[PDB]
Design an enzyme around this catalytic site. Structure first.
Site, PDB file in Angstrom:
ATOM      1  N   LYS A 181       0.828  -1.219   0.000  1.00 12.62           N
ATOM      2  CA  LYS A 181       0.000   0.000   0.000  1.00 12.62           C
ATOM      3  C   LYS A 181       0.859   1.264   0.000  1.00 12.62           C
ATOM      4  CE  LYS A 181      -3.832  -2.319   2.428  1.00 12.62           C
ATOM      5  NZ  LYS A 181      -4.775  -2.063   1.257  1.00 12.62           N
ATOM      6  N   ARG A 193      -9.881 -11.704   0.118  1.00  9.72           N
ATOM      7  CA  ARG A 193     -10.741 -12.672  -0.552  1.00  9.72           C
ATOM      8  C   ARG A 193     -10.107 -14.097  -0.600  1.00  9.72           C
ATOM      9  NH1 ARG A 193     -11.139  -9.087  -5.829  1.00  9.72           N
ATOM     10  NH2 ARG A 193     -11.042  -7.628  -4.039  1.00  9.72           N
TER      11      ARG A 193
END
Ligand SMILES: [Cl-]
Ligand SMILES: [Cl-]
Ligand SMILES: [Cl-]
Ligand SMILES: [Cl-]
Ligand SMILES: [Cl-]
Ligand SMILES: [Cl-]
Ligand SMILES: [Cl-]
Ligand SMILES: [Cl-]
Ligand SMILES: [Cl-]
Ligand SMILES: [Mg+2]
Ligand SMILES: [Mg+2]
Ligand SMILES: [Mg+2]
Ligand SMILES: [Mg+2]
Ligand SMILES: [Mg+2]
Ligand SMILES: [Mg+2]
Lengths: 517, 517, 517
Positions: free
Chosen positions: C300, C377
């Protein structure tokens, strides 16, 4: 209004209309809608019984049968900076305002006044009073200075600019009594003085608040004309259009202005002096007057470009004009003050300056414009030359010049740059008296090497590192060395992000500096 | 070398080995490979016949039958700053070095010495001399100060660090005679003093030049041990490992160090004092000692991240250690000096601190680490607490802390931050004497509001605007208010981009400051 | 605390401790430190004399001799949403809280309770009461629901998490009387129910607030163990380590966890049911439990990466655990609830997953991990498979899955995705009852084409456009089609930027959904 982009018409001005007096009335006797008391942490001390030791708070609490000390304790008010208690009771309203433990003059009293104004607005008060919980060991002169700083905080804190809002409520505040700080001619004279400074501050905020489709270069020149017409016995005006500036060979200014064919540039020259015979020291106040700055071909891009706030790129000019407005009322003897703003907007069109263009300032020096978003210093080059040509002894310029200064000094502190140590001392002392925040930054001469051009006498834009300093060094190429000169980069404090509004920063410091000459 | 990443082995040190003396020898009589003359613009004045008026240049030109003034004229040398003429002739070599028209002490004489060293290196000179074209109206004391500043410029200008180059030429310079500035004990004492300062400057440059696979935290602690062992009668050492720092509850330091499991951290404590009985003022010099800074999880990214230069993030520590090296030779009485560096590298691994982690410094305050690339102030938090706990009266810290300071002040000027006005005056005066460039920046307290956390006592990283100031304000939370303390953000001048090398910035100023206590 | 990174030790929990009752006491008779009155705009109507028409406000104003209507008028309070008046007088304190003109149940009453809590905290009140200015035409059941929503606003609004602050003040609020909304068993039962939900909400906020060096995967598993041990007659627990998850072939989960060798992963399985004999509907609540998310090798980066807030990437797991905490107290019959969290942190090391790696989930499908920052996920793939394997009829997952949902729906509204229309209706109705904001988003099947891999069965990361939808479609590959399943992307509302704190979003909706099965 059919000639304005977007058809926008300002409402009537919201400049405050407040009657201010200094009174001897015992605080417990005073009658009106709100009494604000400034209290330091020491002022809040309590005895063995949890009662106030401060004689004024003790007395007020005693009249309220303990309601004031009960509420203070429950709300954990102990006079710290930023704290306040608000009490509504039969007969009136009191607010205690924390002043902290190192109450500095005049900023503490500004904040007391601002807090009194915010509490007036939230109860729709019309008639208020402010007192200090203690005036022990303040001299008569310190109490007069605290009185006029309180008046300043109240007036400026009351101001809400609603000219562009379709629905809003007018301010209800009508009168302020300042209690326990002295009465009579000298305190009234000092309060009047603060009011004159406030009218200039408020004009400054209005000029900067107004968007650039409303305050164009023409409108800024009309605002300067209105000041001269208001004080026409002591202020004269000359407005030069683009053709006259071309005869004066202002190529750096006219190059910045070249793109903006829809809102033509005007060069504003005001001159204050009283019509008497004594010798006058000649001073100039030069303000950067970019009524909007897109960046030009070097367009302002990126999420924090702040392009949407660039109506405030005339913030230096707003301070110079506000100073003229104040000085027209104050009428000091012994000074002749030139207020000079090369007003324009920095746009994009087929007529505009290209990055890499070489422009020639009115002293003959050539500038390679390696970034068109460093355009303020090009308009200032020609403004500074003109100011020197009026025969002045000292110049201060104010400009929203660089992002670099805000990196250095944060949003609230302006950077002051000068070759002249005495002038630095004068401006530092003027700011100590006005309460405004500024800080001397060094004119590190070795960085001038980065400003060399392969083709012109210099470039306009140095590296990011040291960018406020090379800005200052660039301006220095346009100032006669016999003139004392100081440049004040006010990119930060002309605008408050937290309030989303203009501050009118600079006006009070400039007025103090003039009066100390 | 098999334990070093990349198998790199440094060559032998290139610290200069120069014999320096002050002589009375008439300049025209002196014999050797190169004579450098410092000349101001005034010193270069010529008469009606185009001959030098300066009596020394007149005499030298006369011996060279006009060759010196012919060459000067053709090359347009007129004594301006940065100019030089180099003349090789039967019998020797002369270089004239321009000093400009406002020769400042000591920087002008530093530059004269540097120029003499650069001209020595380019003709492989072994024995050189430096003189001033004029010493008129310099006091005996100013001439002594100019002599030791010349010696400094020559020594430091001669230094070329070739430890990591597989082929290079050793420096040929062996001796320097400083002519016409005085002889005898006092000038020799002052030159010796400069040499001791130079040895510390050069150790500083070596520690910073060396890449981070060579100068690890362990190696930095060994370097401090070597200083103490060299001067073991006056300097003692205590090196604390991670386990000992944990017993001391240094959670902010150990959190920064947590990722770097391959190069463990060491906390370096040196203490200088002479073993005599008089009262000693207790001082601490605290240096940020990040031997490498990747940014941690807030990795340094972008084309001018400068990640590839972050071996210089121990530049503050290099100044503190160099100051210890100088003071071990100088042995001042009346002072006890603690040199403290919390050394570590800021890496990325599974063991590392995450952005958002809350760390607890050794005074119990909690810090939300909203950016792991503001890690130097976390190591300094615990270093400052430790320095206060040693009972010192005054502290100076040096740290490569912020990009914001370089934006503010450019690459060459350090920003000094302090609540203590007397300490600011002491450091400004120490820098005036050392010739190093620094500038006081304000500790604007209103910006502390931006450092609030929703969960810990504070965050570590404020907005970009005002970033050097909130850095200073953060450090202040870790300093006992009874201790005078100044923080010097030296992110810029520890490294020269133009030379691609370390400067050893800070050593000479710290030594002056200690000696002025 | 020596095993925690940064040596941080949390203080004692600040979960509120408030005694709550429903009373019939006439509001004018009630005694205590603060009475809060919820008033709509209509409730504030005044007559010809400027007196309140509302019978309760009329009566209170009459006891205060007009002080309440005087203060309201001066402060321009007219019952609008967000407005409040606070009056301290001999005998007590009253606050009027504006409810607006379209008071929605239960959110309006939540906000009334929150406002009452904020006013309690600012006067250090211990015993408070809340009433409505009017209850006309509210049914007995609507008044009971408004009572329990008020209790919720007070409890949650009182909570201040001070575990990581070195100095702070404990909450003073001790009791709440809810007046005029009913008394006796049914209202008390509903208030008790809200309190149980609040204890789960508060545990949720605590788990999310705590930084990732404090709440590691191990600590999250210990928190689940503590819930089971507290309610061990109705909740059992099984914690699986990495080795057991490997035997279960959880390759997508273990691949995400692979880098974080310092804080090993734990897979949390709680199961609630009462030990009786009736048929139970089998449900699963699956929460994304990334205790920190750096992004992994797809780190990030960027100024609004929000990496420093990624302790809140276990926000879905915090809702599932808080729901378990609530249901352990509520003990509903007829349901068996599995609470499943695959807990880990997503770090960078030599052991970590690389972008482009192919991982195999426990149903045998292969995933090309084209972005390691879409790791939630992958952990959910294996959690969903495990949930299906426990034989459940319906599953809800909560995950902080995508930035795309916050772009779509802002920070305050979660996106609900499901192939199953009846389950969507159930969750929409559960949220209407809980007051939480969510909105069905479509599972547009044509976008599945963008999720194709050139080498594996699928990629994990689709284009930015439609990113929340392809997230949902990806999860669908891991859910048995016989099981009804809904995915709730709660990236936004698990965290409040304005409060800088966790919300515990999701707990009350999940509890309602369970109770409506
Ligand atoms: Cl009244
Ligand atoms: Cl206007
Ligand atoms: Cl003049
Ligand atoms: Cl020879
Ligand atoms: Cl070494
Ligand atoms: Cl002390
Ligand atoms: Cl009472
Ligand atoms: Cl915990
Ligand atoms: Cl089934
Ligand atoms: Mg610009
Ligand atoms: Mg501009
Ligand atoms: Mg860093
Ligand atoms: Mg660093
Ligand atoms: Mg992620
Ligand atoms: Mg994630």
């Amino acid at each position: 209004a059919g000639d304005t982009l977007g058809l926008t018409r300002p409402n009537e001005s919201d400049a405050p209309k407040i009657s201010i007096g200094a009174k001897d009335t015992a605080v417990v006797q005073w009658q009106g809608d709100l009494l604000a008391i400034g209290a330091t942490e020491n002022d809040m001390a309590r005895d063995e019984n949890s009662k106030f030791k401060n004689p004024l708070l003790q007395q007020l609490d005693s009249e309220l049968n303990g309601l004031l000390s009960a509420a203070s304790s429950e709300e954990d008010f102990s006079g710290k900076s930023g704290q306040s208690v608000n009490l509504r009771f039969p007969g009136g309203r009191i607010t205690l305002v924390g002043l902290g433990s190192s109450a500095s003059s005049p900023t503490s009293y500004h904040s007391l006044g601002q807090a009194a104004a915010a509490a007036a607005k939230s109860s729709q008060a019309r008639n208020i009073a402010v007192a200090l919980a203690s005036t022990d060991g303040l001299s008569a002169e310190s109490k007069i200075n605290s009185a006029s700083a309180i008046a300043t905080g109240v007036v400026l804190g009351s101001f809400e600019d609603n000219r562009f809002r379709s629905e809003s409520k007018k301010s209800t505040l009508e009168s302020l009594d300042i209690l326990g700080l002295g009465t009579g001619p000298e305190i009234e004279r000092k309060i009047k003085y603060a009011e004159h400074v406030c009218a200039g501050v408020i004009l400054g905020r209005e000029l900067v608040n107004a968007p650039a489709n409303i305050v164009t270069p023409a409108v800024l020149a009309e605002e300067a004309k209105k000041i001269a017409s208001t004080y026409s016995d002591v202020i004269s005006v000359n407005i030069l259009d683009a053709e006259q500036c071309k005869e004066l060979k202002m190529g750096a200014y006219l190059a910045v202005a070249a793109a903006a064919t829809e809102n033509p540039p005007y060069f504003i020259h005001l001159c204050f002096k009283t019509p008497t015979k004594e010798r006058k020291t000649k001073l100039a106040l030069v303000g950067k007057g970019l009524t909007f700055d897109s960046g030009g071909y070097n367009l302002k891009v990126g999420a924090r470009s702040r392009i949407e706030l660039m109506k405030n790129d005339m913030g230096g000019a707003a301070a110079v004009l506000g100073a003229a407005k104040a000085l027209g009322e104050i009428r000091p003897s012994r000074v002749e003050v030139h207020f000079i703003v090369a007003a324009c907007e920095n746009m994009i069109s087929a007529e505009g300056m290209r990055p890499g263009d070489i422009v020639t300032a009115s002293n003959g020096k050539t500038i390679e414009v390696n970034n068109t978003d460093a355009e303020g210093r090009l308009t200032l080059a020609d403004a500074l030359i003109y100011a020197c040509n009026q025969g002045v002894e000292k110049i201060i310029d104010l400009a929203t010049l660089t992002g670099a200064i805000m990196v250095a000094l944060g949003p609230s502190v302006a950077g002051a740059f000068t070759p002249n140590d005495d002038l630095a001392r004068e401006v530092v002392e003027a700011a100590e008296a006005s309460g405004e925040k500024l800080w001397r930054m060094p004119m590190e001469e070795s960085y001038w090497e980065s400003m060399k051009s392969g083709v012109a006498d210099m470039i306009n834009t140095g590296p990011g590192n040291g960018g406020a300093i090379t800005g200052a060094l660039f301006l220095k190429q346009f100032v006669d060395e016999k003139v004392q000169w100081l440049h004040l980069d006010v990119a930060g404090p002309v605008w408050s992000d937290e309030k989303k509004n203009a501050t009118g920063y600079g006006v009070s410091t400039l007025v103090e500096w003039v009066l100390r000459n």
